[PDB]
C-alpha cells in the first residue's frame, strides 16, 4: 500500500499538461511526431482548442 509521488511512468505518450507554482507558469510538452515543427503545429492547434473553453 505504498507508491512514489513522482509516478514518472511509461509505455505511453501525451501532451503532458503541467503547471509550475514556483514561477506561476503552465507547461505543455511535445511527444507525437518525429520533427519538432510538426509537434509545434500539433501543440499550436491544441493551444487554439484550449482557448475554446
Amino acid at each position: 500500500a505504498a507508491r512514489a509521488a513522482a509516478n514518472a511512468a511509461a509505455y505511453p505518450v501525451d501532451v503532458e499538461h503541467s503547471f509550475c507554482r514556483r514561477t506561476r507558469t503552465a507547461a505543455l510538452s511535445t511527444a507525437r511526431y518525429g520533427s519538432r515543427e510538426a509537434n509545434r503545429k500539433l501543440l499550436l492547434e491544441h493551444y487554439n482548442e484550449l482557448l475554446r473553453a
Binding site: 500500500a1 505504498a2 507508491r3 512514489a4 509516478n7 514518472a8 511512468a9 511509461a10 509505455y11
Partner: peptide, 24 residues
Amino acid sequence: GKGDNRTRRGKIFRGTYREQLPSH
C-alpha cells in the same frame, strides 16, 4: 517468510507493499 503472504510487513519482503510502477 516473516509473514510473507498476509502482513503489512512481509509484503515489503515479497516486493508487493511497494506497488510495482507501470513500466516496460
